Design a protein around this nucleic acid. Structure first.
Ligand SMILES: [Mg+2]
Ligand SMILES: [Mg+2]
Ligand SMILES: [Mg+2]
Ligand SMILES: [Mg+2]
Ligand SMILES: [Mg+2]
Ligand SMILES: [Mg+2]
Ligand SMILES: [Mg+2]
Ligand SMILES: [Mg+2]
Ligand SMILES: [Mg+2]
Ligand SMILES: [Mg+2]
Ligand SMILES: [Mg+2]
Ligand SMILES: [Mg+2]
Ligand SMILES: [Mg+2]
Ligand SMILES: [Mg+2]
Ligand SMILES: [Mg+2]
Lengths: 244, 141, 107, 191, 203, 173
RNA sequence: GCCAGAACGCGACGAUACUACCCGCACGUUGUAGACGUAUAAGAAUAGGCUCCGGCCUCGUAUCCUAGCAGGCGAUUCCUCCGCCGGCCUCGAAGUGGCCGUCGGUAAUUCGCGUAUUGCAAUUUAGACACGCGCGGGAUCAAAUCCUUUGCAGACGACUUAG
RNA sequence: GCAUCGGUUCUGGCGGGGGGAUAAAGGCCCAGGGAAUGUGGCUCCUCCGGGAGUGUUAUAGCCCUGGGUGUAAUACCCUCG
């Protein structure tokens, strides 16, 4: 027989697979649509979360009830030491999707980035990019400039490899974090020239973002061990005299 | 106001049009029954091209470019034969491209093994002088 | 010099057994002959001999390849497929393999 | 019942040129050029005489024969449009609230668009953009007239129908509220 | 009939089910098939009928768990053709699986399979089967309104490979000029009797 | 099926009261004379009080076309059974022989009206002598002066065993 | 837009000790849904096309290649075709082809020696892909887990860190 | 494996005979009678291809009845090898 009284379902099926995230660092899935009429610019950053605090300001919203009156709002503070660019990548379009064909690195790598490629760094020999480094200063880097010309010839989107300077934070961790940030600009030649000019140099957050701008935040939520249906989905509790 | 139209144009089926049946036979149209069947016959001295009088379906026929002029509708075998000989249909058909290719084809199914070897050697003999001229022209460019 | 090949047989394929819709009889096989379309043309190969050659693992008497011998029995259908009978039924895993058709009993 | 032979003819005046290729018609004359694609109909074109175009269908059904006169009239309309053009007239009808329009000029491209304000005393500003090749004028001959003109009948008529269809009254008795914009006259530019 | 090592079929202008029946028979016989330009096939009937048929296909799914056992609805034109072929093969047996291993399907013309001769099956061509005046659609378009995402990539790329083929055509046309002029110059000069000797043999 | 014309003559068995009875003759279209006699007894049972047990067959013959190489128009009068009630028609055909018109009529009624062989009676078949006595417009169209028509879009014949053609065919025969 | 990511779907890069890797040829225990000339690239229309601008088109029933101990040894003849390497250009959908040069082979014509005996048939043991081995040349001198620790994590495994 | 035979069976080709309106048609010849989707002429219009009318073989031909060449050939059915 039918249900007696109607009610909406508990929870949402959009966020359905409720398993632990595959990777600790948050993953960006899409980037803003490219437009070749603005100057070249980056489209992402990454930092660490400090805490929350309270502010006070007055509102400017004509026709509202609290117009031209003081309000109290809560805010959050994100630590953002400068990041360092290490290399860039190019992708091509195939009838099966996007795929990367080349990548170029900088001459010198920090010990922070070099820590990322190892699981036991203390007892290793730290030979990460030793043989790769000799590709510089050999035929004046003809091999290196060859793939850069290839990217200028065959690629359609260009991303840049950047990492954080975690040593300037009170964190105990010494392993840095690495990601790619897409460059939206006029042309592929301009993109590659601008990206290459940023090798082993720091970039500050004020060049990327600016005041009163509407942004997005990606991270991994707080974890709880293993919970029942009442807290996981939010169902009604059974009467007090229920057995089992 | 000159107007130029380039559109296809088929071959008309009138009385006097000669068809080519599947087994290498020619027949002249004397009467149309439907859009699928016609009445035709061909009196020819050559026994290979001759056909009796009767009805032939239009799906088993091909339209040849030859047309007999001023053939009366529903004529008898004697009058059709008279116009066939006066117009010389058999002599006209011999020089068409269909007949020549058919003859060069027919000569090919009748080849003894010894003749196959002979034609292979003759083809190589002509090819030798063929490549010399090709190389001479290609070098000159 | 003399780069030509060495072939004195007609190649064929092993299609299936003789069957109804749910029952099969391994006694006779069906073979598709190269270049034959009608059953009148298929009459030329009646009584000829066919061979099926395959590779084994061991060497027994100077070779590692075995052969099974058979012969053509009668035409089948209107499309030139033919029936054949071998001393042993074919391994039933060769549905799609190739066989050699000789020209021994000539004319 | 299949009809063996059905044929029609179109005369052509000594002013314009016409060329057809792969059932694609190109008509060009003193007032411009037009294109039409007729690859979806099986018709046989031919030149009957020095100034007559013939078209025909062989072994067609009743349904197939029906489209022959449609094709003939479409090409004749193209000839008329390329030698005399077209011109439509429309009128505004309001009872209490006057309706104001603004046909601003080319918006950095060939298309015109007409803006309509104060329909039945509504504060919506409503915008419609017409297909290229149509020229819009506010008449000065007499009061409260809109003039549409162009080369192709299909585009001129479609733009006029867009104007007619955009002014609609909702949730009211339309036998009483006769407010709106309607078409009133069809004709050629010349004579 | 003839036995080739592998044969490549150009898919443009072929009826889906009529081509799939020939292919399914050849695979079970032992031939190797490669189908190219799967986005240019045709289906008889008006387009909306095909769309409604696909929607009725899309509504089917396992109730208790959609991640297992349920009919998985592939969205590419080549996968639609593959489903059609798979329905005509006993794919639940070892023999059927081996037969299916002899088939390749692609959209467009991949680089291994261009610079090759492309065959045509005349028992499935649309221009020889359908009535003029009837209605048909395109599998590529049907996939567009069901979720295929790479329509424009193949469309732009095909213009590139067709531009390369125009230059290859120009070279082939020039080459014929030397072969024809050489044959005309050579045949007259030398052979006294091989000409008519070949002519009597039909060459 | 494959028909041909017969004539069959029957008679009531002579008796002492009525020696020399009358003789009846009919024209019957039948594949063979075995069913020609059966149709003769079937039609006669609806006209006279004679059965097969009390009658006899005098003669059966075959009628052949006089001029089977001349094109002519025919007209057929017939009755049949529908799913409810009976009806009469009158149709026309154009061909070279009398027998084929009956063959075409049987196939035509079987296609257009779903009428089987069991429920068709042939009343009269007549050759149209003139050209102005043709009524139906699908036969009027075939006797126009200087008839001629093209044959567009005709598929060439290709052997059903030769798969994998090497070039695109053409329909310009 | 958003969530999971095929545990038998794919791509780029880093470092690779143990002949683990690369190059050359040497055989062959061993594997294969099944070589035996495994020879052929325009696009587009089908109620219209191709082109040498003279013509041509139902048809691949086509074109190329095709002789010699399973293909020997010499000569008269002939400047064709085929192959391995090397150097310059080119090719990104799953990266390919062209030109030039050295070397080796070569009936388009016509000849001289040799073939037997496998005994009147018995697959014509011959192809290319992998893989295991043996030599002789080059390059290289790495990581992971257990363990102690951390709490952004946690039923136990697992996860983020440090040594 | 081959040659010569026996039993059962499948599948090709060749030489004859009989029957029906002693096939019907058809070719050539003789005699008579007709018509039109009217041949050649003649008249008119159109120069723009041609169209309209009159009228029975002429510079094309067709239909109906009787006779010869005939015991003609061929199709279908049956039958001896
Ligand atoms: Mg309930
Ligand atoms: Mg906790
Ligand atoms: Mg709650
Ligand atoms: Mg209790
Ligand atoms: Mg109301
Ligand atoms: Mg699963
Ligand atoms: Mg995975
Ligand atoms: Mg080792
Ligand atoms: Mg070792
Ligand atoms: Mg040399
Ligand atoms: Mg015997
Ligand atoms: Mg006889
Ligand atoms: Mg006259
Ligand atoms: Mg007689
Ligand atoms: Mg006789």
């Amino acid at each position: 027989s039918h249900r007696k009284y109607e009610a909406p379902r508990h929870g949402s099926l959009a966020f359905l697979p409720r398993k632990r995230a595959a990777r600790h660092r948050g993953r960006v899935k899409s980037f803003p649509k490219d437009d070749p009429k603005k100057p070249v610019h980056l489209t992402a950053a990454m930092g660490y979360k400090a805490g929350m605090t309270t502010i006070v300001r007055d509102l400017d919203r004509p026709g509202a009830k609290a117009h031209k009156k003081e309000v109290v709002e809560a805010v959050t503070i994100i630590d953002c030491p400068p990041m360092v660019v290490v290399g860039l990548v190019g992708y091509i379009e195939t009838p099966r999707g996007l795929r990367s064909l080349t990548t170029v690195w900088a001459e010198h790598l920090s010990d922070e980035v070099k820590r990322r490629f190892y699981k036991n760094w203390y007892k290793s020999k730290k030979k990460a990019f030793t043989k790769y480094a000799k590709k510089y200063a050999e035929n004046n880097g003809a091999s290196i400039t060859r793939e850069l010309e290839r990217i200028k010839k065959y690629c359609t989107v260009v991303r840049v490899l950047a990492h954080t300077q975690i040593r300037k934070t009170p964190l105990k961790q010494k392993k840095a974090h690495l990601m790619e940030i897409q460059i939206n600009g006029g042309s592929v030649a301009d993109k590659v020239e601008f990206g290459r000019s940023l090798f082993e140099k720091p970039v500050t957050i004020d060049t990327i973002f600016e005041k009163d701008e509407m942004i997005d935040v990606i991270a991994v939520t707080k974890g709880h061990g293993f919970v029942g249906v009442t807290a996981r989905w939010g169902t009604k509790k059974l009467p007090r005299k229920t057995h089992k | 106001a000159e107007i130029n139209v380039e559109a296809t144009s088929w071959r008309r089926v009138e009385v006097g049009r000669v068809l080519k049946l599947e087994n290498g036979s020619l027949a002249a149209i004397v009467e149309i029954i439907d859009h699928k069947r016609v009445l035709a016959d061909g009196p020819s001295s050559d026994p290979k091209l001759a056909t009796p009088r009767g009805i032939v379906p239009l799906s088993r026929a091909l339209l040849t470019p030859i047309v007999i002029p001023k053939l009366p509708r529903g004529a008898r075998t004697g009058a059709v034969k008279k116009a066939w000989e006066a117009y010389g249909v058999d002599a006209k058909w011999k020089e068409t491209n269909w007949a020549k290719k058919q003859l060069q084809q027919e000569r090919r199914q009748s080849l003894t093994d010894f003749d196959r070897f002979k034609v292979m050697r003759l083809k190589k003999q002509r090819r030798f002088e063929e490549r010399k001229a090709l190389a001479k022209i290609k070098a000159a460019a | 010099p003399s780069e030509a090949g060495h072939r004195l047989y007609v190649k064929g394929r092993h299609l299936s057994y003789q069957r109804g819709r749910r029952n099969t009889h391994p006694k006779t096989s069906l073979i598709k002959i190269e270049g034959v379309d009608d059953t009148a043309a298929a009459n030329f190969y009646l009584g000829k001999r066919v061979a099926y050659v395959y590779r084994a693992q061991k060497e027994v008497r100077g070779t590692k390849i075995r052969v099974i011998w058979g012969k053509i029995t009668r035409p089948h259908g209107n499309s030139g497929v033919v029936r054949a009978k071998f001393t042993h039924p074919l391994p039933a895993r060769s549905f799609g393999a190739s066989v050699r058709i000789m020209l021994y009993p000539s004319s | 019942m299949r009809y063996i032979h059905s044929e029609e003819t179109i005369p052509v005046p000594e002013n314009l040129k016409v060329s057809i290729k792969s059932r694609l018609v190109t008509v060009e004359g003193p007032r411009g050029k037009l294109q039409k694609d007729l690859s979806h109909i099986a018709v046989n074109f031919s030149v009957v005489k020095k100034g007559v175009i013939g078209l025909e269908i062989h072994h067609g059904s009743r349904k197939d024969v029906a489209a022959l006169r449609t094709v003939r009239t479409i090409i004749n309309n193209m000839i008329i449009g390329v030698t005399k053009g077209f011109k439509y007239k429309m009128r505004y009808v309001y009872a209490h609230f006057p309706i104001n329009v603004n046909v601003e000029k080319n918006a950095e491209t060939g298309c015109y668009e007409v803006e309509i304000r104060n329909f039945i005393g509504e504060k919506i500003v409503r915008k419609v953009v017409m297909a290229p090749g149509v020229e819009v004028e506010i008449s000065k001959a007499q009061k409260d007239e809109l003039i549409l003109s162009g080369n192709s009948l299909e585009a001129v008529s479609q733009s006029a129908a867009d104007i007619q269809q955009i002014c609609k009254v909702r949730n009211k008795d339309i036998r009483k509220f006769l407010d709106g914009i309607y078409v009133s006259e069809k004709g050629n530019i010349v004579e | 009939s003839s036995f080739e090592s592998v044969v490549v079929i150009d898919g443009k202008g072929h009826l889906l089910g009529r081509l799939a029946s020939i292919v399914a028979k050849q695979l079970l016989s032992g031939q190797k098939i490669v189908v190219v330009r799967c986005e240019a096939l045709n289906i008889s009937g008006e387009f909306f009928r095909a769309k409604l048929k696909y929607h009725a296909y899309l509504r089917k799914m396992t109730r208790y768990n959609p991640t297992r056992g349920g009919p998985f609805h592939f969205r590419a034109p080549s996968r639609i053709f593959y489903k059609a072929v798979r329905g005509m093969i006993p794919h639940k047996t070892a023999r059927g699986a081996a037969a299916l291993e002899r088939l390749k399907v692609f959209e467009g013309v991949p680089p291994p399979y261009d610079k090759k001769k492309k065959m045509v099956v005349p028992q499935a061509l649309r221009v020889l089967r359908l009535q003029p005046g009837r209605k048909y659609c395109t599998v590529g378009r049907l996939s567009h309104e069901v979720g295929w995402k790479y329509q424009d990539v193949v469309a732009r790329l095909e213009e590139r490979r067709k531009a390369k083929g125009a230059a290859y055509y120009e070279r082939k046309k020039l080459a014929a000029r030397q072969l024809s002029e050489a044959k005309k110059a050579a045949a007259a000069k030398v052979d006294p009797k091989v000409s008519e000797a070949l002519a009597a043999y039909g060459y | 099926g494959r028909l041909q014309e017969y004539q069959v003559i029957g008679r009531h068995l002579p008796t002492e009261a009525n020696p020399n009875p009358a003789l009846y003759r009919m024209r019957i279209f039948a594949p063979n004379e075995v069913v020609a006699k059966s149709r003769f007894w079937y039609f006669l049972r609806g006209l006279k009080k004679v059965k097969k047990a009390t009658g006899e067959i005098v003669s059966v013959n075959v009628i052949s076309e006089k001029h089977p190489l001349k094109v002519k128009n025919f007209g057929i009068w017939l009755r049949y059974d529908s799913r409810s009630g009976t009806h009469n028609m009158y149709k026309e055909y154009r061909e070279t022989s009398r027998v084929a018109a009956v063959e075409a009529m049987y196939a035509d009624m079987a296609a257009r009206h779903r009428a089987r062989f069991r429920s068709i009676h042939i009343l009269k078949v007549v050759e149209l002598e003139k050209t102005e006595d043709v009524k139906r417009p699908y036969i009027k169209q075939l006797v126009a002066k200087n008839l001629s028509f093209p044959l567009p879009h005709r598929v060439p014949k290709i052997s059903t065993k030769k798969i994998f053609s090497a070039k695109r065919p053409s329909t310009f025969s």
